[PDB]
Design a protein around this ligand. Structure first.
Ligand SMILES: O=C[C@H](O)[C@H](O)[C@H](O)[C@H](O)CO
Ligand SMILES: O=C[C@H](O)[C@H](O)[C@H](O)[C@H](O)CO
Ligand SMILES: O=C[C@H](O)[C@H](O)[C@H](O)[C@H](O)CO
Ligand SMILES: O=C[C@H](O)[C@H](O)[C@H](O)[C@H](O)CO
Ligand SMILES: [Mn+2]
Ligand SMILES: [Mn+2]
Ligand SMILES: [Mn+2]
Ligand SMILES: [Mn+2]
Ligand SMILES: [Mn+2]
Ligand SMILES: [Mn+2]
Ligand SMILES: [Mn+2]
Ligand SMILES: [Mn+2]
Lengths: 419, 431, 421, 421
């Protein structure tokens, strides 16, 4: 089934086909003069996938308010239908990230809907940073690191349930992000809290299938405003190293202190084999969870530069998980996810254009200016024609958001769904 | 009316009177050696008041979750009852700050309950950063600076209603904090948005009584994550100067960029006569809204140092409004407000101990070390005995939280009020 | 000609074919977008930014300085080097002087400038360091020092800078001082600012009718607790207090972490106090790195506000543009060349913004399309436009490549003695 | 004695009565709290922190250095001044040397230290600046430089520092380098770190059985884009990789804005890699201001983690303590005196925390009482304990007052020639 009528996709592609041909051929000639085969780049770009978050499909909110738009998804099934639109038009988001209990539903039904829509499932996400109705023990003062044994046990069991749901739908990983921490000096004993966390995570690790990975996600602050148990990549590395080979670190771009060199953290984790994956988004102040690349596109490119360099250095067994983790408070969630996925492919494509041999030479000779200009020559390249052609060749739309709007999809679901 | 049994207050005071007498006399002797009359300090401290936020007595939350405790107040009336406890025990929070529509209710009843509890009302707070039921125009894309004229008009009318409510209960000011801004480059035209804001505030200004003040509150970010119309004190100054004499700037401690020298902003606003008031709280990362002085007590003292210096060089008319703006997510709201008000008086008392003449000399002589040590000599002084004696002498508790717990108030209201339920913070819609 | 014309010609010819292909391709793409590439190029070739005399020599940090070869022996050598930057980029016809670093006979400075085809931008005073023979030290301040005689001395220095500027063609004085405190209590914030305002008022009295006085704010460094002119708010208060000739200068790296700098630019323009800019890039503090080398989009967003001002018809808006950078690990000339290029790049992209479309998206609160409208311009590779602008004005298609081909650095290395003490 | 004993005696007697009153009052208050003031004073008397040789001279920024009178020139003058700090505070018996700044015949250094009653803490290498005659420049790095010969030179320098330390009684080497990049792409993050680790392994091989090797992380400066040893995470990787003798040194001002530094301390302790501390205070960057002059509570919270670690009986816990500050606008000796005092103040307050009560409030999630339990200790004015500790051990009740009364500064000013009168 197609959420967007194929005739609309075809019409909107034909409408822009002439211009795309001109732009693609021009870029192809330019890249040829630079010793690059545009076809090789396009081939790789159409193979780059990033998971879409179920929680990014509906309108998000801040601690002050939430302003829903029309046709808001009523539950996970509406969310999957909307995710199908993003994948159909961008062809870059074949998999969806589920969050439990937000997306709790019959696993078999979720799988059935996914297969029918042509969607798979990425890492499962547990939730012990909020209480559900009728919950025995509250996570107000923590979960996996709570001082109360029964509360930690409940948190561990919840994570095990997430694994069971994931096994039924085809997921192969569990991502653990908790709000555990303190808001006041002295409230928590830093070391004892971390010890409790490690012990609880060891229980989750024990119940982790051998064909699964366990990702821990660090965050400097929020909801905890003084200290956070898994506060940065250093603590995260200690966690992954302690737990075992199936445990790795997940880097969410907006979870770092002001001015942090995030691409270096990425490089360090790769060198020590603990880069499990990414949570892409952009930010300017805190964990803003904005559309990827909308604020600092160069930083996104620099992160991908490290990923491509890893392949160039010959790093083996490196297949980091890629996922978008964003909240859309003032835009149509589907449109934001579409352009965010596009931006991630944009940064990747540009990273593929870097002349690695030239860069290596400038690095060895300490020619800082030419080294940085070598990266800029790739980053400054407008790869939109490659992204558009990749989409066109794989069943997507030349201009995804334009096609989405032309389809009238939002108005359609607005009529099918309550206000 | 006394929310806390007088016999309990008396009992818990007597239990700690002996120790307090010893500490107070010891501190008195120490201050005497330093040429300071402890009685003069205590007299000033017992007269220092800070407004308590009605939204502070209810458990707060983040965008991820809210974890209510027992005996959560149902509405403004329950909140007033709880605020009465803070005032009774600390004697430092006689006035309450209301937020509309959260606390909307019959002005006559609000005023009636306040008088019965011995509580007054500080500045009113308007709310155009969220949508209420039946609202004609959404504030999703802004309010006072929204591109849509009808939306700005609705926001203006709401603020005027806040003034009308305040006039009936004894309030003398309106604080305006909005979330207006953008999450993406290009979404808003910075200049046009600010022009719209200024025009809307001018309409609100026209509705201000002669003895009223209009306080605009700046904030770097949140809910807007790229730009905010009233983003810092610079824009705030432009607003206040543009609007008129009754318009001033409100400084919320947790609303500034990392590493900002906040006490300097305070001094600058005082110098140009635009320091409307404060929203006290503490923080480490963003607008954390934590208990005042719980993270950076020296910074709080340094802010008070600027205020007391002004109070010293006689900046007449200068009467900034002091208010606590905090959210309590992991403590009993009443206890946190009690200790926060205490910490504010602590910083004030220490600022009063500064040898101004000595400091001035070291400043003129560029003796940086002795100048800083002159501030430290005041700040290092443990003024707790003064704070406790001030409370005891005015009908309060030597140890407020201790007396609060001994009274069993929380368990009391917990049995009178309906049970609460924990949930999310609205990060996503129902599912 | 600092750089042999035959070298510039040879290197331009070597790259002519590719430039033609790229420029024509971009022109067709822009035409499809309703933009005339020729109109953009014509404006870009007229965008100028002042080159700092202090940026031509290798810079350093408080830990160390690592000079390269052929370091300039003073202002005359510095002007010669600035001439290279202008000849190759054609985007830096004016030089920013700093006194007393560049103190010399005004007549000689003017003669060298004219001979090289260079003019002079705003003068920069220096009361953040002590020069020989000073009766008073600036250790504890200058224009805001507690000692009246010290303030008077700093005022006289600034007036001297104005005299030098008048003689060479300058029309403005930029004042940046380190005045502040390193400890709470050391300074009375208000009295220190009042002293500063009194001293600046005196300097203001010495301004010719057609001169401007620019005050430059900075959050910290050299002062590590408080700084008198710490941010744009205090800066606005200064400009408004002094008069119409006084405006604020915004140095990109002088703001608190995460500050929305482009908004500050918009605010100052709205109130007629945006005197000018000090361009550079940074990641941590006032790093003074090559413009756009760290955050190119931010640079574009600043230019977006500048171009919007013109779009809104702001009257009498002629902000000064200057590069303020230090080059610690690169050939200073090469870094200034590429920095000037990046500045023109961001400017060119700002010119490409479809503001008619943007205005509509802003009115309808279509945040996604509004931001995509800016991105469509920013994502455009305008290098062909910058290169063609250089070709037509006597510059080099690839400035740094031509610079290296000329062997200039090796040449001056043999002519200039390296300091030995 | 640098300071005449009669002066120390006179200035102590002048303040003896007030100290007695305050000490007895605090003793009674602590008694009511179940604490023996005598036990606290005994512990405070034994808490030592190393004084930096580079701290007694006036510091500066990249903009300027404003020396005071009697500036110590050379390590011998510096040791004489360090002796004053130890005599008056009795809290700084050991000095931290920096090579080559303090290079001198080891026998003479040792002899001078012994004569002044001073020992030597960890040695500090310098490959972040170039020395005269140096074969390879550190402009682009040292231990992680791309050039093998440059890395070898850096390694040899560090080995030389170990040799000097062995001769004077030092038992550790602290390695802080500026290695990094100012531009994206300039360095390959991974390869640079691999080179650093290989170089450090060579240095590790030259460590005596009873020596420690401390690596010091820093977010930025001198490198403004990336730094090889940028944070505690990389630092942990270094220490774990090198071996049991390698640990991490935490300099308070070397972290990103808002970082929870006390947590980093706890984490390193838990994994046995907390080598030591570089105490100072800051507000913006690596300001290197007097300890506790900006954020005294943070300093106390760091000490709370140290005292807790000992209370828990953690193994491998025995950190070195050193002051790493620069004094740009004060008498260096006075600042070091009061900074050492502030460090002992924070330590003393940490000793007052009721650990049993705190543990209970933590287990029961009583956040308010847990934080108040820390505040009860922090709010306690321990000055009487610090003063009594000094008085009982040969120091001064009020160190700075005694220092000024002695006229020491004027004395060395008369013995040491300044650049200009
Ligand atoms: O801040 C929360 C983290 O980004 C987590 O990944 C979280 O589970 C996700 O954002 C959903 O709220
Ligand atoms: O961030 C919001 C500001 O602090 C306002 O004062 C607000 O109205 C208050 O915090 C209640 O949410
Ligand atoms: O930080 C100093 C400012 O950028 C000034 O413009 C200064 O005069 C210039 O950088 C030269 O040092
Ligand atoms: O920033 C430099 C580090 O703090 C090092 O410890 C350094 O060796 C010391 O500060 C002396 O410069
Ligand atoms: Mn995430
Ligand atoms: Mn997040
Ligand atoms: Mn507030
Ligand atoms: Mn707030
Ligand atoms: Mn500048
Ligand atoms: Mn600067
Ligand atoms: Mn250090
Ligand atoms: Mn340092």
């Amino acid at each position: 089934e197609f959420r967007i009528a194929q005739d609309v996709v075809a019409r909107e592609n034909d409408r822009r086909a002439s211009a795309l041909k001109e732009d693609y051929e021009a870029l192809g000639a330019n890249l040829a003069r630079r010793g690059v085969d545009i076809e090789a780049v396009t081939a790789k770009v159409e193979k780059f996938f990033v998971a879409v978050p179920s929680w990014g499909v509906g309108t998000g909110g801040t601690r002050f308010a939430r302003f829903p738009g029309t046709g808001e998804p009523r539950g996970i099934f509406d969310k999957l239908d909307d995710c199908a639109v993003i994948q159909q038009l961008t062809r870059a988001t074949p998999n969806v990230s589920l969050h439990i209990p937000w997306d709790k539903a019959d696993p078999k039904e979720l799988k059935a809907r996914g297969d029918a829509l042509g969607l798979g499932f990425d890492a499962m996400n547990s939730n012990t940073f909020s209480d559900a109705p009728g919950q025995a023990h509250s996570y107000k003062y923590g979960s996996l690191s709570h001082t109360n044994a029964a509360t930690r046990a409940q948190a561990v069991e919840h994570n095990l349930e997430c694994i069971e749901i994931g096994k039924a739908i085809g997921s192969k990983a569990l991502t653990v992000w908790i709000g555990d921490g303190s808001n006041f000096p002295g409230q928590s004993n830093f070391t004892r809290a971390f010890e409790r966390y490690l012990s609880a995570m060891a229980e989750i690790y024990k119940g982790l299938p051998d064909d699964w990975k366990l990702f821990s996600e660090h965050k400097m602050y929020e909801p905890a405003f003084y200290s956070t148990v898994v506060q940065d990549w250093g603590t995260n590395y200690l966690i992954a190293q302690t737990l075992g080979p199936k445990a790795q670190c997940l880097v969410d771009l907006g979870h770092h202190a002001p001015n942090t060199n995030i691409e270096m953290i990425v490089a360090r984790l790769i060198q020590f084999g603990k880069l499990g994956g990414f949570h892409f988004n952009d930010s300017k102040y805190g964990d803003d969870d904005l559309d990827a690349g909308a604020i600092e596109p160069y930083r996104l490119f620099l992160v991908f530069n490290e990923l491509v360099d890893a392949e160039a250095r010959g790093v083996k067994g490196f297949h980091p998980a890629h996922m978008i983790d964003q909240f859309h408070n003032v835009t149509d969630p589907i449109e934001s996810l579409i352009n965010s996925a596009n931006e991630i492919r944009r940064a990747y494509a540009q990273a593929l254009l870097v002349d690695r041999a030239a860069l290596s030479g400038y690095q060895e000779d300490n020619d800082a200016l030419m080294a940085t200009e070598t990266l800029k020559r790739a980053y400054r390249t407008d790869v939109e024609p490659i992204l558009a052609e990749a989409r066109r060749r794989t069943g997507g739309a030349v201009d995804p958001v334009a096609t989405y709007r032309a389809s009238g999809y939002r108005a359609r679901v607005a009529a099918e769904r309550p206000a």
